[PDB]
Design a protein around this ligand. Structure first.
Ligand SMILES: N#Cc1cccc(-n2nccc2-c2nn(-c3cccc4c3OC(F)(F)O4)ccc2=O)c1
Ligand SMILES: [Cl-]
Ligand SMILES: [Mg+2]
Ligand SMILES: [Zn+2]
Length: 313
């Protein structure tokens, strides 16, 4: 109960900032997550023995892929911790609990491949989940882990609170399907402008949570330029492996996934920032003003990519 997790002075302070990088020491990442849980939710919200066993089973069920890995899971949980800590009074007890877990588990058992590739390959998961394929798998994997002996971190919840937390996590994980992000942001933009946005409307809370999940999931674009630039290598590592696999199926991949079209990455990145990232952090800053540092850092990285095109780097 009185076993408070503590970090070195530099991490203790920088972990509070949106642009924190969790570092290259894998064995510190569990402690970084518990630290964030204990500060974002409390020391009582979970049994430490169960949470630890849950974290290590989650870790075991992330694959050794270039980007969609254990580091990504913990990085996305940290962005969410930063949002929650800067918006203290806007979120319920169950929401603080559910959202950090949701972020940690949101890419469980990812193979490094898109829903599009699973469909064209005719992977069994495409037959099981026709839409948001990997995201329905990520949630399935989360439930299975919770049901392992001594892994149910939610044990102390009532049938009503347990169903509520599992429902927050499901919606949160499904929202990380980028195909669903575009419509969700449009609706939130419209609602925000017409003044219909009501955080007592559960249907509206869901949409704002979904947008927070997009924001956290894409947060590599909100890091300091060297982190953003070096993460891009890992992101494109997976994209080019998928393009290779598309060519194995006799299908020319889109330029984004074609390793022959490496020259086109910087422009491809401008399109992503302008069409996905900046709109995401723009709408999020409108609903949740304290998240403005994510938008600012994103625009900074947009500028750096434009500098890359103009031969300035
Ligand atoms: N979910 C997810 C996800 C997956 C990989 C990667 C990222 N991610 N995170 C930070 C930056 C990026 C990124 N994503 N895309 C991308 C992904 C998916 C679909 C797409 C994408 O562009 C698209 F608009 F053309 O359609 C392209 C370039 C990027 O730098 C999220
Ligand atoms: Cl606090
Ligand atoms: Mg995902
Ligand atoms: Zn992800």
């Amino acid at each position: 109960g009185l076993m408070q997790f503590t970090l070195p002075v530099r991490l203790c302070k920088e972990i509070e900032l949106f642009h924190f990088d969790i570092g290259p020491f894998e064995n510190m990442w569990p402690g970084i997550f518990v630290y964030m849980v204990h500060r974002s939710c409390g020391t009582s919200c979970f049994e430490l023995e169960k949470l630890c066993r849950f974290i290590m089973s989650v870790k075991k069920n992330y694959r050794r892929v270039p980007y969609h890995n254990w580091k990504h899971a913990v990085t996305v949980a940290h962005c969410m911790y930063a949002i929650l800590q800067n918006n203290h009074t806007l979120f319920t007890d169950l929401e603080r609990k559910g959202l950090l877990i949701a972020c940690l588990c949101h890419d469980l058992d990812h193979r490094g491949f898109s829903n599009s590739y699973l469909q064209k390959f005719d992977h069994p998961l495409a037959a099981l989940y026709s839409t948001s394929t990997m995201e329905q798998h990520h949630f399935s994997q989360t439930v299975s882990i919770l049901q392992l002996e001594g892994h149910n971190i939610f044990s102390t919840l009532s049938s009503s609170e347990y169903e509520q937390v599992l429902e927050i996590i499901r919606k949160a994980i499904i929202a990380t399907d980028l195909a669903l992000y575009f419509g969700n942001r449009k609706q939130l933009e419209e609602m925000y402008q017409t003044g219909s946005l009501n955080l007592n409307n559960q249907s509206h809370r869901d949409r704002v949570i979904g947008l927070m999940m997009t924001a956290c999931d894409l947060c590599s674009v909100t890091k300091l330029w060297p982190v953003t630039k070096l993460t891009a290598n890992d992101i494109y590592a997976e994209f080019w492996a998928e393009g290779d696999e598309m060519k194995k199926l006799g299908i020319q991949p889109i330029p984004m996934m074609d390793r022959d079209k490496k020259d086109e990455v910087p422009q491809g990145q401008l399109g992503f920032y302008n069409a996905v990232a900046i709109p995401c952090y723009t709408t999020l800053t409108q609903i949740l003003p304290p998240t403005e540092p994510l938008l600012k850092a994103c625009r900074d990285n947009l500028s750096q990519w434009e500098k890359v095109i103009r031969g300035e780097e």
